[PDB]
Design a protein around this ligand. Structure first.
Ligand SMILES: COC1=C(OC)C(=O)C(C/C=C(\C)CC/C=C(\C)CC/C=C(\C)CC/C=C(/C)CC/C=C(/C)CC/C=C(\C)CC/C=C(\C)CC/C=C(\C)CC/C=C(/C)CCC=C(C)C)=C(C)C1=O
Ligand SMILES: CCCCCCCCCCCCCCCCCC(=O)OC[C@H](COP(=O)([O-])OCC[N+](C)(C)C)OC(=O)CCCCCCCCCCCCCCCCC
Ligand SMILES: CCCCCCCCCCCCCCCCCC(=O)OC[C@H](COP(=O)([O-])OCC[N+](C)(C)C)OC(=O)CCCCCCCCCCCCCCCCC
Ligand SMILES: CCCCCCCCCCCCCCCCCC(=O)OC[C@H](COP(=O)([O-])OCC[N+](C)(C)C)OC(=O)CCCCCCCCCCCCCCCCC
Ligand SMILES: CCCCCCCCCCCCCCCCCC(=O)OC[C@H](COP(=O)(O)OCCN)OC(=O)CCCCCCCCCCCCCCCCC
Ligand SMILES: CCCCCCCCCCCCCCCCCC(=O)OC[C@H](COP(=O)(O)OCCN)OC(=O)CCCCCCCCCCCCCCCCC
Ligand SMILES: CCCCCCCCCCCCCCCCCC(=O)OC[C@H](COP(=O)(O)OCCN)OC(=O)CCCCCCCCCCCCCCCCC
Ligand SMILES: CCCCCCCCCCCCCCCCCC(=O)OC[C@H](COP(=O)(O)OCCN)OC(=O)CCCCCCCCCCCCCCCCC
Ligand code: SF4
Lengths: 70, 98, 83, 115, 172, 72, 318, 155
């Protein structure tokens, strides 16, 4: 009957869920538990570059807090 | 930037040579005209971006608008030429010499 | 007018796209001229701080400008806060 | 660099697919197979003759309207301006004259596919 | 990754050379589409993306209408691509050799400094405001709506008058 | 006898409510939505397809098939 | 890790479009009082794979009267543009985050039109020429309409990005503020994808196969993949722009699920339209767009210029 | 063993070609009326994976369904030749089989096998749509029996 289309619909459903979820998880894994930190403007890019210089491991996502100040 | 600007100036020169040297096709001449237009657009955009002349950034849009107007007029004239003869040949339109 | 009403009703029955387009064109012309919120858009875009506010020297002859951001002087944004 | 790599990966994927399509199967090429189709008969013309399209005025109008589109597209940054009254008036005038040109062409039967 | 803009400019030069060499207008429109995409990439590399995307979209529409017209009237039984005459190919490779020769000459003659092989990719972007919001291309094109209303109105009148012009030319 | 298939008897004049109904029919694509509903009902019906080599199509004793020579 | 991200974007999209072919055949069958394929797979799920293997094991059959360079370039161009168009979509985080995402979408769609045109002209046949000219007319009409629609909708939005569309539709959809733009955008996506009612480029009845009439198997499969990928993409773009899925900062999985459900619904809507309606004439499509949608969308573009000014609801730059 | 791997690969390609059979939108007469009755919802060829394509470039099998006239025969031969290489022919009905009712006509090719190589003959006038579906499945079995890779390997 009409529910015979549901296997193909479910395969399309999982194949459309997979890319966005995988992109979010890969962004988290690459950025260390945080999001991508998109930089639309030069100020945001400067913040990213400053964070990369501050961290010392040349990774902008390694956040440095109050433990650096005595 | 100076190497790229030299390349863009040479591209304009090549498109000008294409415009001046006809090969039997008014459409190809119009194509060379729009190649000159594209070269000028890229030159103006690169110059404004390099000099940070955001006040002069409307200039490429203006030249694009007027260039598309002239391309429109050229296509209309090519339509009239094709209706007159049926071949669109610059050597075929020659009867004004006398 | 009878002829105008009959023409508009016939146009609304037969070509109800040009009627909608002209009505929307007229509404988009008229509505900024009668709305009480028209000045607020310009004031919001003015109050949006895309640049650093460059401080001025203290010659002691201007009492209008503040001396600190936590002062009653200056262009407060309570209109936008309560808008 | 990332977008460049994705573009090159998609291009290489399409090239790999068409290379597989061309080197995988068995080829048997002869003249009647590779002749142009023409619904089971030999074509009378060469399929390169003039075609004489009927919507040429609509195409030129499309060029002009595409450049009007290019003019209208910086509006999302234009509405962030500090004046907004001259901006609103200018946008109204631009859309109005574009609509007036379309209306004049419609009245003069420009978009009617003259045969 | 330094000479990326130079590679793009060379590709633009090659595309304009093909357009000058004048194939059948199908391939002329192809060469202009490639040159438009390359110039878009050059503008994007030099700065704001709005101008490059604008010229790309505009030339896509333009070459589409051009393709329709060269199918309609500017066509022939055997539209020459580039190999109908060996002179066209020989002249293309001659222009390529001349381009290489001239850039080598200008690299050897490094007194003026227009093209330098060692200094290529060093002077692409001169000075940029590192910290700052609303400094990209497209803000000025928006400022055409508020600061250059004369530019806006002459462009709009050009398009309006152009509609009237094309109707009167193709009135027949 | 005969009948008309597209001729209309007189006219329904011009009215604001009828004009609004025609305007909504044109703008809201009502007959298109109706056709969508019809094929949606067909989607939710049961198909007439038989499983071919296991369920054969019905026939009749008069059916003309393959020839044969008979015996007493 | 980025190449793994590219794989997890590209491979699910290709499997999704193959099963879109399966879902299209089954939905059309069940609306035609028959079934879809149910023999090749357990429930027909192996039918697209069998079709793909047959098409890639038939010969490509290069013709005599054919510009071979463009004849080969065009289908690969179409497929790579479909995937490149799939690149910048956020669900809710894009693979490639672009400031001018919608402009990128428009440029890539126009280049796909060029792929169709070059295929039609290169396959030197009269039916291919007919299909190419019909593609020219169709893209003229929907290009001008689509540009105006996106201008007005993104004027209601802020920048030309798509994460900004997510944050705009965080509280409410854009369908309720601009539903006429949504209707005209749905029709324009049909015209962009060359789908029924107004396909007119692969017109099986007016022409034989349009621009694919000389393309044998292989590159024909490439054209089909590009077309169906563009179908899923236009429906995905419609649900990102107008039917905004629920977004929460803590978990994006419900955003991805909501996006999936609405994209599936709009793809099934495309198949529904194909089952329901007959074909336009390609001059009637141009007349319909340029005489109904273009004046209405010009007026609505003016209305959406005026609306944030008189309501003071101008969106932020970021 | 290379024989086993080659046999399984050949079975895979035969399965693909038999599960995706695309006949051409090409008929001639009452037999083609029964052919679209085989396309009808009852004996769903699309359920079998059999779907018409208009162009011969996208076709796999020509179902010669009708009377092959002398005036028609160059068109049928040209259309068959324009197919890509793995192509099959199902003659359908008495006309396409051996001329049938018009066998002694001055204008009828006595069987379409005089023009194109016929893979499967389907008898009837008209054969029922069930009978044409039987011929289609018999063609599927026939191309299931093919051993191209194994013949190549022992070649
Ligand atoms: C009275 O007078 C007469 C007539 O007048 C009325 C006649 O007419 C006439 C002629 C009569 C005939 C010819 C009869 C023929 C019958 C008909 C005309 C009617 C039957 C109906 C139709 C033709 C309409 C069919 C309608 C449909 C809705 C069916 C759908 C059809 C489609 C073509 C669309 C769906 C698509 C497909 C079937 C194929 C889709 C699949 C692919 C292309 C596969 C591509 C996918 C990939 C490449 C994916 C690969 C990628 C991957 C990642 C996969 C991974 C793979 C792995 C192996 C891992 C005669 C003689 C006549 O006397
Ligand atoms: C969907 C994405 C993937 C698409 C691509 C498909 C991937 C999976 C392919 C699996 C099968 C691979 C081999 C297919 C060969 C098809 C053509 C064929 O059978 O040719 C027979 C021919 C036989 O050659 P032959 O020696 O008989 O001579 C041919 C000429 N005649 C017959 C006239 C004398 O070629 C081969 O057998 C080549 C086998 C190559 C195997 C590669 C692995
Ligand atoms: C410097 C490097 C940049 C490239 C320039 C050097 C290499 C190209 C030189 C010009 C070749 C022109 C030529 O041969 O044209 C004949 C061909 C036409 O020939 P044809 O296809 O009609 O005939 C060939 C027939 N056979 C194969 C049987 C012999 O035209 C092209 O190749 C032009 C196609 C487009 C090329 C560019 C595509 C860019 C991507 C688009 C998306
Ligand atoms: C993405 C979200 C979902 C979208 C909808 C998807 C589901 C529905 C799909 C339906 C089937 C679509 C398949 C293709 C159909 C193609 C035909 C078609 O649609 O033609 C267009 C038809 C054309 O109709 P036509 O062509 O028959 O018109 C006749 C015209 N002549 C005689 C000149 C030929 O309709 C339109 O153009 C209407 C467009 C939408 C209009 C919306 C107006 C909304 C109201 C505005 C404001 C009103 C108040 C005014 C101010 C008041 C102030 C107080
Ligand atoms: C320098 C200016 C002269 C260039 C000559 C190019 C070759 C030539 O003679 O072209 C003439 C041709 C006329 O058109 P056509 O229809 O082809 O006429 C055939 C003539 N019986 O016209 C054409 O074919 C159009 C040619 C356009 C060329 C534009 C690009 C020029 C690039 C090279 C610049 C000069 C390089 C000099 C190199 C010298 C050696 C190192
Ligand atoms: C400032 C101006 C622009 C503002 C924005 C709106 C843009 C509109 C652009 C197009 C306008 C064109 C109008 C003139 C025109 O060309 O009308 C043609 C049309 C008949 O043409 P057609 O429908 O093709 O008919 C074929 C044969 N019957 O003619 C008709 O159908 C007759 C229509 C008569 C009624 C017009 C609408 C009146 C609405 C009044 C609203 C008041 C509130
Ligand atoms: C079969 C042949 C096919 C040939 C045609 C290929 C078409 C490709 C797909 C369509 C492309 C249309 C034009 C798109 C241009 C890029 C759009 C864009 O906005 O790029 C800018 C973007 C970064 O800009 P923005 O978003 O502002 O980010 C700043 C802070 N985030 O990103 C960037 O700055 C990245 C810049 C590079 C992006 C494009 C890379 C293209 C690489 C070349 C491809 C073709 C090579 C030649 C053929 C190969 C052999 C077949
Ligand atoms: C891998 C190598 C082996 C490939 C299959 C070879 C055996 C085969 O074809 O088995 C037949 C089986 C059913 O197919 P069939 O015989 O058509 O069934 C008619 C029933 N009504 O066929 C099947 O069950 C289909 C097997 C498909 C295997 C996967 C194909 C790629 C995905
Ligand atoms: S065999 Fe019989 S049914 Fe078939 S085409 Fe001939 S006369 Fe018609």
């Amino acid at each position: 009957m009409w529910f015979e289309i549901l296997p193909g619909l479910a395969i399309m459903g999982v194949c459309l869920v997979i890319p966005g979820v995988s992109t979010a998880y890969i962004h988290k894994f690459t950025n260390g538990g945080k999001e991508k930190r998109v930089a639309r403007v030069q100020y945001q890019w400067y913040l990213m570059e400053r964070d990369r210089r501050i961290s010392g491991v040349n990774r902008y996502y390694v956040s440095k807090g109050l433990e650096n100040i005595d | 930037m100076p190497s790229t600007f030299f390349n863009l100036t040479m591209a304009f020169s090549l498109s000008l040579l294409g415009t001046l040297m006809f090969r039997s096709h008014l459409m190809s001449t119009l194509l060379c005209l729009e190649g000159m237009v594209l070269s000028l657009f890229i030159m103006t955009s690169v110059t404004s971006l390099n000099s940070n002349s955001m006040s002069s950034m409307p200039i490429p849009i203006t030249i694009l608008v007027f260039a598309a107007c002239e391309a429109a007029v050229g296509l209309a004239l090519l339509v009239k030429v094709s209706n007159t003869y049926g071949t669109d040949y610059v050597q075929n339109l020659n009867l004004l010499q006398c | 007018a009878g002829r105008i009403s009959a023409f508009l009703k016939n146009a609304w029955a037969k070509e109800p796209v040009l009627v909608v387009s002209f009505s929307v064109w007229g509404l988009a012309i008229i509505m900024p001229m009668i709305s009480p919120y028209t000045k607020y858009a310009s004031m919001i875009n003015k109050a949006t701080p895309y640049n650093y506010p460059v401080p001025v020297r203290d010659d002691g002859n201007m009492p209008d400008v503040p001396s600190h951001p936590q002062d009653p002087l200056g262009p407060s944004l309570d209109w936008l806060k309560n808008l | 660099m990332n977008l460049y790599t994705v573009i090159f990966i998609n291009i290489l994927l399409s090239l790999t697919l068409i290379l597989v399509a061309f080197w995988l199967p068995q080829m048997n090429l002869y003249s009647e197979k590779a002749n142009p189709y023409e619904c089971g008969f030999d074509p009378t013309s060469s399929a390169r003759l003039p075609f004489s399209m009927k919507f040429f005025l609509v195409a030129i109008t499309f060029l002009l309207f595409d450049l009007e589109i290019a003019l209208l597209l910086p509006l999302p940054w234009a509405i962030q301006t500090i004046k907004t009254s001259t901006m609103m008036i200018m946008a109204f005038i631009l859309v109005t004259i574009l609509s007036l040109g379309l209306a004049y062409e419609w009245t003069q039967k420009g978009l009617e596919w003259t045969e | 990754m330094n000479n990326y803009i130079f590679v793009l400019s060379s590709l633009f030069l090659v595309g304009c050379l093909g357009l000058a060499l004048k194939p059948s207008p199908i391939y002329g429109g192809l060469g202009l589409i490639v040159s438009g995409f390359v110039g878009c990439l050059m503008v994007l590399g030099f700065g704001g993306s709005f101008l490059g995307l604008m010229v790309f979209l505009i030339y896509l529409g333009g070459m589409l209408v051009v393709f329709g017209y060269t199918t309609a009237m500017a066509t022939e039984e055997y539209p020459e691509t580039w190999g109908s005459n060996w002179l066209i190919l020989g002249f293309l490779v001659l222009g390529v050799i001349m381009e290489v020769f001239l850039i080598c000459v200008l690299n050897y003659y490094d007194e003026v400094g227009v093209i330098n092989l060692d200094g290529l990719g060093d002077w692409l972007m001169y000075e940029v405001d590192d910290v700052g919001v609303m400094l990209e291309g497209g803000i000025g094109v928006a400022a055409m709506y508020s600061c250059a209303t004369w530019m806006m109105v002459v462009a709009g009148w050009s398009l309006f008058a152009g509609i009237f012009i094309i109707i009167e030319i193709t009135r027949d | 006898t005969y009948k008309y298939v597209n001729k209309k008897e007189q006219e329904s004049e011009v009215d604001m409510k009828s004009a609004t109904d025609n305007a909504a029919r044109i703008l809201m694509w009502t007959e298109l939505i109706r056709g969508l509903g019809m094929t949606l009902s067909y989607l939710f019906r049961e198909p007439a397809t038989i499983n071919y080599p296991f369920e054969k199509g019905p026939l009749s004793p008069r059916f003309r098939g393959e020839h044969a020579l008979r015996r007493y | 890790m980025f190449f793994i991200n590219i794989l997890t974007l590209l491979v699910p999209i290709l499997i999704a479009m193959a099963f879109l072919t399966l879902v299209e055949r089954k939905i059309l069958g069940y609306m035609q009082l028959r079934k879809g394929p149910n023999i090749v797979g357990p429930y027909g799920i192996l039918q697209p794979f069998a079709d793909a293997m047959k098409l890639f094991m038939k010969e490509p059959m290069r013709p005599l009267t054919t510009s071979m360079s463009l004849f080969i370039i065009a289908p690969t161009l179409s497929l790579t543009l479909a995937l490149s168009l799939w690149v910048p979509l956020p669900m809710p985080h894009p693979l490639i985050n672009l400031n001018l995402g919608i402009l990128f979408i428009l440029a890539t769609s126009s280049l796909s039109v060029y792929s169709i045109l070059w295929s039609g002209w290169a396959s030197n046949s009269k039916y291919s020429l007919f299909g190419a000219l019909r593609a020219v007319a169709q893209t003229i009409s929907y290009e001008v309409t689509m540009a105006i629609i996106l201008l007005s909708v993104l004027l209601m939005n802020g920048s030309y990005s798509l994460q900004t569309l997510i944050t705009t539709q965080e509280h409410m959809w854009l369908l309720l503020p601009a539903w006429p733009m949504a209707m005209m955008w749905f029709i324009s996506t049909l015209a962009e994808t060359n789908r029924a009612p107004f396909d007119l480029t692969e017109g099986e009845s007016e022409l034989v196969s349009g621009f694919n009439v000389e393309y044998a198997a292989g590159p024909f499969a490439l054209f089909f993949m590009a077309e169906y990928t563009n179908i899923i993409l236009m429906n995905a773009l419609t649900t990102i722009i107008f039917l905004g899925p629920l977004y929460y900062i803590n978990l994006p999985e419900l955003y991805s699920t909501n996006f999936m459900m609405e994209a599936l619904l709009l793809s099934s809507t495309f198949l529904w339209i194909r089952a329901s309606y007959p074909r336009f004439r390609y001059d009637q499509l141009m007349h319909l767009l340029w005489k109904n949608f273009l004046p209405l969308t010009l007026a609505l573009c003016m209305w959406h210029i005026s609306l944030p000014i008189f309501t003071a609801g101008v969106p932020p730059y970021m | 063993r290379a024989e086993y791997v080659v046999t399984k690969l050949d079975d895979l390609i035969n399965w693909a070609r038999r599960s995706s059979l695309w006949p051409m939108t090409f008929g001639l007469a009452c037999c083609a009326v029964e052919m679209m009755h085989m396309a009808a919802p009852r004996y769903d060829m699309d359920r079998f994976g059999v779907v018409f394509r208009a162009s011969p470039r996208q076709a796999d099998v020509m179902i010669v369904a009708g009377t092959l006239t002398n005036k028609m025969a160059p068109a049928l031969r040209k259309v068959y030749d324009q197919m890509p290489e793995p192509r099959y022919v199902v003659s359908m009905g008495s006309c396409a089989n051996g001329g049938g009712y018009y066998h002694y006509s001055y204008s009828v090719v006595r069987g379409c096998d005089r023009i194109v190589p016929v893979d499967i003959y389907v008898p009837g006038c008209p054969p029922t749509a069930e009978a044409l579906l039987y011929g289609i499945l018999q063609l599927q079995r026939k191309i299931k029996r093919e051993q191209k890779l194994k013949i190549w390997y022992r070649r």
